[PDB]
Amino acid sequence: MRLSREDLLERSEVADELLTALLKAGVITTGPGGFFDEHAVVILQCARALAEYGVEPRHLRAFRSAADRQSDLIAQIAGPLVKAGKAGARDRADDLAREVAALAITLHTSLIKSAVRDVL
Amino acid sequence: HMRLSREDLLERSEVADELLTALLKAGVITTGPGGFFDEHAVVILQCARALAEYGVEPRHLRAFRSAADRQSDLIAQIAGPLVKAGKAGARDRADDLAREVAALAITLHTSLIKSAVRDVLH
Ligand SMILES: [Hg+2]
Ligand SMILES: [Hg+2]
């Protein structure tokens, strides 16, 4: 959940040089708390395997760019639903925002898979 | 693999024909090159229906399609040249490597977006 740089390296099992390069290119970043999440471990492990096929850290900038733009769109769509959460006795509940976010990601992913299958 | 007629897609997705119409006219969902739908269209249609139920109209999904098409090209630039590099032994098919590579890049991209989204709502 909340991983240090050392934890990230140890769990991803990549070279420190790879991590350093992916941070330098902005491909991976820490969250608002200043630590890494489980997604970072998966990004790092996928980035290592891709580097092995010829993809440099520098080439994954395009993926990060697009993911940030997609996150903005999702925010616009999901952000309004934070206030509609079934809070119960608590003051806040973002569970519907998370549901809309997860549906939009699954939709977007399936579009990619479809288009990639086509072009190949 | 799997080539669905329009009515096969409606039956498997349990989504209304009018919703499919709206998605096709917005350009969010398209048929493959032969005029069939694939298994991914089932998921897309069902996700679009649940999104519509949260007030997100098919036309507001257009941007996910355009983005998906740009990403698909970036993945093809990587994977495309590796088609010819797959082992072609008796127990192999040459498409495998380019598929594995596409699947890594898609997994990478999915994690990036999940990470960017967690942060945009933290
Ligand atoms: Hg991996
Ligand atoms: Hg879905």
Residue B56 with chain A: CB contacts under 8 Å: 77, 100, 104
Q: Residue B119 Cα, ligand 1 centroid: separation in angstroms? A: 23
Cα(A54)–Cα(B76) distance, rounded to whole angstroms?
13
Per the CB < 8 Å rule, is A67 touching B33?
no
Cα(B43)–Cα(A67) distance, rounded to whole angstroms?
21
| Beta carbons of A45 and A14 less than 8 angstroms apart | yes
Instruction: Give this entry's resolution in angstroms.
Output: 1.9
Q: Which residues contact B92 (CB under 8 A, 6 or more apart)?
A: B86
Cα(B26)–Cα(A71) distance, rounded to whole angstroms?
21
Q: Residue B111 Cα, ligand 1 centroid: separation in angstroms? A: 12
| Beta carbons of A94 and B103 less than 8 angstroms apart | no
Residues B86/B100/A30/A105 CA torsion (nearest 10 deg): 140
Place of tokens 């973002």: A94
**Residue of chain B with shortest Cα separation from A67:** B113
Q: Which residues contact B112 (CB under 8 A, 6 or more apart)?
A: A27, A39, A43, A63, A64, A67
B55: left (phi over 0), alpha (psi -120 to 50) or beta: left
